[PDB]
Amino acid sequence: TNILAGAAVIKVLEAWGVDHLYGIPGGSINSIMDALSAERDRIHYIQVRHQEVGAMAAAADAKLTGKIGVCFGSAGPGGTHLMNGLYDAREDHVPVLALIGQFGTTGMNMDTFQEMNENPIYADVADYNVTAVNAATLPHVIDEAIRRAYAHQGVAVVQIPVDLPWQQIPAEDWYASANSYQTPLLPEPDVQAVTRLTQTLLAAERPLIYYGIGARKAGKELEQLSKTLKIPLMSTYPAKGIVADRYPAYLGSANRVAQKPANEALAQADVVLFVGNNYPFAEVSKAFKNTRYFLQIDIDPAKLGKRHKTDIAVLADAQKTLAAILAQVSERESTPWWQANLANVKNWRAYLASLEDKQEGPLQAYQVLRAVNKIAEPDAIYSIDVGDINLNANRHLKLTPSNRHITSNLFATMGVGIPGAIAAKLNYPERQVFNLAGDGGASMTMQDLATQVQYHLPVINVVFTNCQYGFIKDEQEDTNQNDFIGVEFNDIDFSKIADGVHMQAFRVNKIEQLPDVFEQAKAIAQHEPVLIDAVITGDRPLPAEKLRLDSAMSSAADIEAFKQRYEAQDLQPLSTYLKQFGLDD
Amino acid sequence: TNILAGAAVIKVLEAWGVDHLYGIPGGSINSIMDALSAERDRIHYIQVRHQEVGAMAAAADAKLTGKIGVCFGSAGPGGTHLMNGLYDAREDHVPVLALIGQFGTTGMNMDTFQEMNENPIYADVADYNVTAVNAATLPHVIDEAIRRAYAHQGVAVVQIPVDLPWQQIPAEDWYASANSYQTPLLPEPDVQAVTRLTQTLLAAERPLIYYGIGARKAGKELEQLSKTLKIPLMSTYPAKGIVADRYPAYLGSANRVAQKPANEALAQADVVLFVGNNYPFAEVSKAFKNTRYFLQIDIDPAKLGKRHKTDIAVLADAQKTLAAILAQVSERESTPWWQANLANVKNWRAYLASLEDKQEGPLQAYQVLRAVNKIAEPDAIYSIDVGDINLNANRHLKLTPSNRHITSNLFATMGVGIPGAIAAKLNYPERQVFNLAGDGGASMTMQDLATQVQYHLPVINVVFTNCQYGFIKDEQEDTNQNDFIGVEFNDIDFSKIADGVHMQAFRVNKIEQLPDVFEQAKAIAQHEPVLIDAVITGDRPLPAEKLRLDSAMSSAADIEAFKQRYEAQDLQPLSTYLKQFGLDD
Amino acid sequence: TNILAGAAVIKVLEAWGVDHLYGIPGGSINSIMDALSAERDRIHYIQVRHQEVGAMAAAADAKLTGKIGVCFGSAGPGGTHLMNGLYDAREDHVPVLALIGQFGTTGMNMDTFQEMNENPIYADVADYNVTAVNAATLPHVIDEAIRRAYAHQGVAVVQIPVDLPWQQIPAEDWYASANSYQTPLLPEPDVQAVTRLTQTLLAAERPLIYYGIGARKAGKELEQLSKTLKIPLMSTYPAKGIVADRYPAYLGSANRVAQKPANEALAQADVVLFVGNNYPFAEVSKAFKNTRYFLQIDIDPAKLGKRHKTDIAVLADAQKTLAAILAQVSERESTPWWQANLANVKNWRAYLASLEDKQEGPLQAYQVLRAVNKIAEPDAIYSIDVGDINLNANRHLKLTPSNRHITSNLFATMGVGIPGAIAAKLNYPERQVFNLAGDGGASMTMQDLATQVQYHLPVINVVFTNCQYGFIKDEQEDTNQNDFIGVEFNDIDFSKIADGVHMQAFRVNKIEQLPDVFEQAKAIAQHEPVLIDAVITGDRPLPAEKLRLDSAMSSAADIEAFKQRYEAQDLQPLSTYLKQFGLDD
Ligand SMILES: Cc1cc2nc3c(=O)[nH]c(=O)nc-3n(C[C@H](O)[C@H](O)[C@H](O)COP(=O)(O)OP(=O)(O)OC[C@H]3O[C@@H](n4cnc5c(N)ncnc54)[C@H](O)[C@@H]3O)c2cc1C
Ligand SMILES: Cc1cc2nc3c(=O)[nH]c(=O)nc-3n(C[C@H](O)[C@H](O)[C@H](O)COP(=O)(O)OP(=O)(O)OC[C@H]3O[C@@H](n4cnc5c(N)ncnc54)[C@H](O)[C@@H]3O)c2cc1C
Ligand SMILES: Cc1cc2nc3c(=O)[nH]c(=O)nc-3n(C[C@H](O)[C@H](O)[C@H](O)COP(=O)(O)OP(=O)(O)OC[C@H]3O[C@@H](n4cnc5c(N)ncnc54)[C@H](O)[C@@H]3O)c2cc1C
Ligand SMILES: Cc1ncc(C[n+]2csc(CCOP(=O)(O)OP(=O)(O)O)c2C)c(N)n1
Ligand SMILES: Cc1ncc(C[n+]2csc(CCOP(=O)(O)OP(=O)(O)O)c2C)c(N)n1
Ligand SMILES: Cc1ncc(C[n+]2csc(CCOP(=O)(O)OP(=O)(O)O)c2C)c(N)n1
Ligand SMILES: [K+]
Ligand SMILES: [K+]
Ligand SMILES: [Mg+2]
Ligand SMILES: [Mg+2]
Ligand SMILES: [Mg+2]
């Protein structure tokens, strides 16, 4: 006749297909804990060592599977620790439910221990943000939170006074609306608009197709359009892998977490097809300053004309639209623009390979990443932290449509490497999972290496130990007048940290050590997590946004210094290739 | 060459097709004022007498036309006065841009005169809420605010430091994205779900179709489905008029701003098709406690299964889905359920007509509304305030698809009568416009009667003067132990208020006075606004939510008392008609 | 035994001595209404016609008496209407309790009618901002709100789910802490700091004492210090009347709501004693750019050195410190600086008298204010709206320590005239009360003229009808490139508005009409409210911040034009008087 309200809440989560959720208990959330305890055979609580890791892992769950991620924190400090993960979910627009403990309704507003008005804490981050005040409606409030988080692709937060989940409510009244769930309708491309878009693209002298993760279902179409029309491809960094990196007309991404060919080509392009893309550097970097026509395809009206004025804007699904373009075009001959870009890409890839292929000497990030490539399965998943690793992984990982990679794309919170890998291994136990992290980022969430151990999650953790916030040191080099500050720090031996949490580990500092250590790690990670602490040099990775290679633009001295510092003696500027094929820069 | 940033901002508004905008100047917004002053031919500034009326009028603009409404207020108190209209826009989910003055950037954060951090003021109400800090990006920020308000169907607020719009910016850089704006092309309604939904509806013994304003494009289909299938129609109050009130199987709305036949039928129905509907009383009133199967059609995933456990919920457009159902069904013969409902409606309408058709004696609301109907053009627009007028207008106005009516549907702010009528006449100068308001609500925004005069907007204002907050008095009668309080007050003669603002007006207190006064008003309003102050009795309108007519449910004494108080001697309960056609209650 | 929680709440208000409170009922606050209804003998509920007037009146109660003001609004729009008065209370740092209705706990978070999370609405304005969730603790939460509002001199807001006040709670448990309330006993002003401050002040060649309302208890000391030491006095505008306006060495206030002698002297002064003063124009106007030494006395550490670099800042009570200074000084002979200032003041007052003393012709603000002075009792209270009236009243009213005057000092919300006068008459039924308001501000709250009638509050309302937002028109003249906009509008006849609310009234447009109309009004207001609508010219009042009188600073042409426009042919610049008594400018 009755059910505990907390039991009904857990049943709502189960109806919505939640397999696992993260948090740390406290008195103020012990009645939800009690309900979880009874349901342990049907829904799986993962106890993390810091609640930020639970929030980041919930966000990562949703990034990976599209299923709402679920986390919780106890009253006060338990919940405020969630923040970096909740802001990640908001900014990366993925559904997350966060439950926050609160004192019982009989003590709220008494200024009792750790008791505060918690609702204003979450107002900014959350799409939906409510304090529950009744047990009978609590299942509905949770259901509402989930349904809104999905519909609005963001964070729903419910503060739950601890007395409510221990109250009996009528067993027959509550329900979940999971049964009724659907994903948003996919809008269709207007036929005439797409024909006009196609005509403009085909009349271009120096076209590019520039896609983001909105085109994640359209890899086949992107690559075929590129091949058929002889139009190079470039992407946002997160969209790496949608088209295989091997594809010879894939230029990479622009700006800083970027590849040289993409920056150079974008500056020359006359027509850009911007599809499923919300590149946040568009305006501030003047990326499209010299673009003649700008063609946009996006499913979200809020994005149409956002990043540059459009000449044709199509409010439609990327794959449907790109398919419709492909269906109305035929094979075109090579052009000078096409060949200049192909040559530039080959030159760039030879540079990257030269860095990877060193066989002995002081270890650099580049060889560590080659060693990752050498042990990587074709459907591996990469959880990447924030810093130089985004830049280096973007250049060196050899991804295909079978891979996934995630980071904190826009909020760019450090520390996500560890939680993202925890989430990945929970969702895909049979796929290989890497955590690629700098030392600064790994430090921030290091304690949750213990969580990988506790749940026997066989992540391959690779820490890039430069004893620096390298990404920031380079920024200070670029902007600051006075000496470096806060960017070089003491060593932490992550192989000893790993030992401390009872994880097998290695530390390496020479290129020649890589093959055997990575082979051992590959094997250990058939059953248990492992960590490789790669002590790397302080070499700055080549700044794709600050090239000094073209004599029409840089002094011979600056060019020589750039080539020496970046081992870039064999890199040519795009203008070399433009000139070979008869085009002006 | 250069342009003032303020001039560019006004050009962004013009690009988006903003015809008119409302506000009151102040030093802190005088640079936007300056830009408006140069653009009088292309954009029409309406100076209101209180900023809440500007905000409510902006919301009403969007309710009526679907185009973003625009309002502003000066720093501090100018902007906080907008709140009731901004919350109306949020809750009625219509796009509104609000500009808020702010001190110049050189004095912000100095604690100078009327200078405060204004951003937190608007955080709750707004979908987008930013303080501008640069002139060159100001046109983009306004463009972004508009594009988000439309995309997210809510309020965008921009706080503008007064120095920025007077700064020169490059003439060639700014743009508006109005040219990208479009509406989505949707796929066909999900074929197999619609077919299954149809079977469940047709199998029902006591079906109802219960629609809201999400079905605004589907009036034809709703009426044809009803006629063909012999299924009565009911609606939310705001959806009155989508199907003509005359339609014999239109039951009205449920709850309190409601009609008897709808409440009675809903309690008996076995299957409800809930279409384009977010009825907020669903759960609290247990409206669907008896319903066996609950079927839904809605465009928004956030609504699927929201208001009741839903057997089939189709994510689709209402009109397309209802047309798809109509295309797969055909004539059903009249059923007892159909005939019982027809009879019940006829009885109810006879009751309402008996109230309307009194010819002499103390004036009641009922005859005032009959007099409105007698002078109303077939495409009249009605701006309705908040209180008993919603209840009475819902019962008595004879609307068709050619009419529009608006109120504050969900936030339910009093005072909207006046601003809604201002907005209606500005958008539709050739259509007759009424403002129907209680004395309490008309009092709140009375000063803006002067705005109708100043802009020669020929609104027909009808004030229902009962010297009460009648809607609240009746609530106190129902719930309060102690004497009435705050609900009966001293007369205001609105004909004298009208005279004070130089508007022609009349005061009436007898039924026999109505025809000549309403004829005069109809004629005056060919050229100028007019006000009729109708002094009405304190009679409580029949409570459709507290019927005492069925001898199986209520004592003879209770029924006799109800019939006496509400002049309802000839009303029969639905059970009488159910029994007449051979159905149990 | 038990008590209704609402009844206990009202007993908490009574314990704290709340005489009267303002608001408008609604379903969502009807349980508090019910408790008020049983307690009419002990607490007096004032039903206003717009909730902003309730909030502004609550703030004014606290401004006048130092006792917490209390207001309420129903859920949603009832409460958001409070905002302009709540922000006034925050910015004028006076204690106010605001109660906000909310849906019952069983329907919160169901998205039911007018139900929303109300807590974020009030977060910015409020010192304390909570949603009650339990009946038994509700009296404590109200008690806490009051105690914090007083302690922190600001707004406490409590959102009350309507079910709670109708629940029984144990009669013996609740209490109020009013019995604990007291004011602190402070140590002596810091002896050595006061002695040093005194030496610096006395060593000055061109000293000024510049006080604000923190010196409200120190009028006697200020005047005696000035007389004994031959140091002129100037004040903030709100501190007008602390020293009688008649005092020959009272210079007035600085900036725009200002008097010529204060602006001129401040620019020359070498030492300023800044007492109980938080003048918000200090930095933006560079008021103290020439000042050699800046001395401060303030009670609040947050103010020490805030407005200018301060040589000596004494943390102490103003009256005690000024008395301590007086006790260690003695007579100084008249100085040239003193004599120059006396002469300057005399010249200025002759100018103002020349404006006042016109006997016939087109009515200006100046003569209306003379007529006010002629009927004013010596202990009159003035509620002043926002606009030119601040400027004109500051110049023309002849105040003494027996008067009070209030406006919205810092938030500067228009519309406060009416509510401030309502509050004044409720607190002081035996004192004469004026509401001095511009037409724009009176328009905003005009409906609450009916509240004066309903409660028989004999306010003398004087509306200055220029058919402009004059204060803003003059700003546009000064800053705007393009034509005036939004600042000139259509007449409202407030004598007819008054007739509509059943208040006796007069409209005048000629100087010679004033004496008889003001005498009639004075007599009417022995028993009932009255309104005088004074139709005044559009003449710009002399801008004290833009003087053109000194031939060393301004061209002869500029001076001739200034003298012509402002009827200022006989005003002399301060330099004339400085030279007369042998000082350089
Ligand atoms: C340290 C760091 C540095 C970085 N720097 C760079 C950098 O230098 N260069 C770089 O490229 N990135 C960089 N990023 C990432 C960057 O911040 C942005 O997140 C990224 O550029 C945006 O990628 P996106 O447009 O693919 O994704 P999103 O911003 O998520 O946009 C997706 C777009 O697709 C649309 N969409 C979604 N579904 C569909 C559909 N079915 N059809 C059509 N449209 C659809 C959406 O409406 C949206 O507009 C960095 C990240 C980190 C952590
Ligand atoms: C004083 C007062 C009292 C009131 N009391 C009552 C009352 O007793 N009874 C009553 O009925 N109303 C009442 N109301 C109104 C009530 O508060 C709600 O606003 C109303 O019932 C909801 O109407 P709705 O569902 O039509 O509109 P909305 O709440 O706006 O919902 C529209 C729905 O349609 C969907 N939709 C939109 N477009 C489409 C599309 N193209 N296809 C499909 N779906 C779509 C939306 O997603 C949404 O779910 C009152 C109003 C006032 C002022
Ligand atoms: C339309 C309009 C225009 C205006 N323009 C002007 C203008 O041009 N000129 C002008 O002068 N005003 C003007 N004002 C008012 C202005 O905004 C400020 O409110 C005012 O100048 C500040 O006055 P104050 O310092 O007396 O009061 P507050 O700002 O309230 O400061 C009081 C100070 O006294 C201190 N204090 C309190 N008690 C004690 C104690 N016992 N002992 C010692 N210190 C104590 C406080 O800590 C505080 O620092 C205008 C108002 C309006 C409505
Ligand atoms: C939590 C957090 N703090 C600070 C930053 C700013 N930030 C971005 S990159 C970076 C340096 C990352 O250092 P590390 O993880 O060591 O990577 P490296 O660049 O040295 O390989 C910092 C501090 C951030 N994004 N997130
Ligand atoms: C601004 C605002 N304040 C209060 C309410 C609560 N409320 C809803 S109906 C009503 C009474 C309306 O009175 P009136 O306009 O005179 O209409 P009547 O019911 O007397 O016809 C009130 C106070 C509200 N919705 N909006
Ligand atoms: C509610 C509000 N809106 C706008 C302002 C900005 N403002 C300050 S003075 C003023 C004009 C006041 O006009 P009126 O009351 O007619 O006085 P006048 O200057 O004409 O005598 C305005 C709009 C304000 N302070 N408060
Ligand atoms: K940590
Ligand atoms: K008003
Ligand atoms: Mg590092
Ligand atoms: Mg009324
Ligand atoms: Mg005026």
Side-chain angles (χ1 to χ4, degrees), chain B residues 25 51 74 77 81, chain C residues 386 388 412 414 438-441 466 468-472:
Chain B
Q51 304 85 343
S74 54
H81 264 176
Chain C
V386 172
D388 280 342
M414 292 166 64
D439 52 357
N466 52 12
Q468 304 171 338
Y469 295 129
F471 207 68
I472 310 306

Side-chain angles (χ1 to χ4, degrees), chain A residues 147 175 179 188 302 305 309-310 313, chain B residues 147 175-176 179-180 185 302 305 310:
Chain A
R147 171 157 33 67
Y175 75 100
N179 69 297
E188 304 273 344
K309 193 170 179 82
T310 64
Chain B
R147 176 158 27 70
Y175 71 98
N179 68 297
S180 311
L185 298 172
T310 299

Side-chain angles (χ1 to χ4, degrees), chain A residues 323-387:
Chain A
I325 298 168
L326 183 61
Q328 68 189 282
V329 301
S330 58
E331 170 83 5
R332 296 208 297 187
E333 184 168 290
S334 174
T335 62
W337 171 245
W338 172 248
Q339 293 303 331
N341 283 284
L342 294 176
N344 199 33
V345 171
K346 282 179 60 191
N347 177 253
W348 173 248
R349 292 192 186 166
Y351 169 71
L352 298 175
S354 77
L355 300 174
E356 294 170 8
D357 291 345
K358 299 181 184 180
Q359 294 301 304
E360 68 175 88
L363 183 60
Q364 304 172 302
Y366 318 124
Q367 308 87 36
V368 179
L369 289 158
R370 175 262 292 165
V372 167
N373 288 332
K374 289 285 201 301
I375 61 152
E377 304 292 354
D379 61 344
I381 299 170
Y382 302 83
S383 175
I384 303 175
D385 212 284
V386 171

Side-chain angles (χ1 to χ4, degrees), chain A residues 91-93 186 210-217 235-239 253-258 274-281 296-301 303 307 316-319 385-388 390-391 394 407-413 471:
Chain A
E91 296 300 311
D92 278 13
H93 52 80
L186 303 174
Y210 188 5
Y211 59 94
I213 65 174
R216 65 177 90 194
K217 294 177 57 239
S235 77
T236 64
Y237 151 54
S253 55
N255 190 43
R256 184 178 179 199
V257 177
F274 193 71
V275 47
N277 195 331
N278 197 34
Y279 185 57
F281 300 100
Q296 184 175 10
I297 305 163
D298 205 285
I299 202 161
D300 181 2
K303 304 291 189 296
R307 295 297 179 176
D317 177 68
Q319 182 187 24
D385 212 284
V386 171
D388 279 345
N390 303 107
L391 186 164
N394 185 50
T407 189
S408 177
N409 292 345
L410 184 63
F411 191 61
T413 183
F471 207 69

Side-chain angles (χ1 to χ4, degrees), chain B residues 37 52 80-81 84 491 502, chain C residues 52 80-81 84 483 491 502:
Chain B
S37 186
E52 82 180 292
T80 53
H81 264 176
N84 280 49
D491 179 75
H502 313 304
Chain C
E52 82 180 292
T80 53
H81 264 176
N84 280 49
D483 293 2
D491 179 75
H502 313 304

Side-chain angles (χ1 to χ4, degrees), chain A residues 201-219:
Chain A
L201 184 64
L202 272 57
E205 300 294 343
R206 300 172 305 280
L208 293 172
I209 298 160
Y210 188 5
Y211 59 94
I213 65 174
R216 65 177 90 194
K217 294 177 57 239

Side-chain angles (χ1 to χ4, degrees), chain C residues 348-359 364 366-367 566-567 570:
Chain C
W348 173 244
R349 295 184 183 169
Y351 168 73
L352 297 176
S354 75
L355 305 174
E356 295 171 8
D357 287 349
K358 299 183 192 183
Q359 292 297 299
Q364 304 173 301
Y366 317 125
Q367 303 89 36
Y566 303 115
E567 321 187 45
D570 295 331

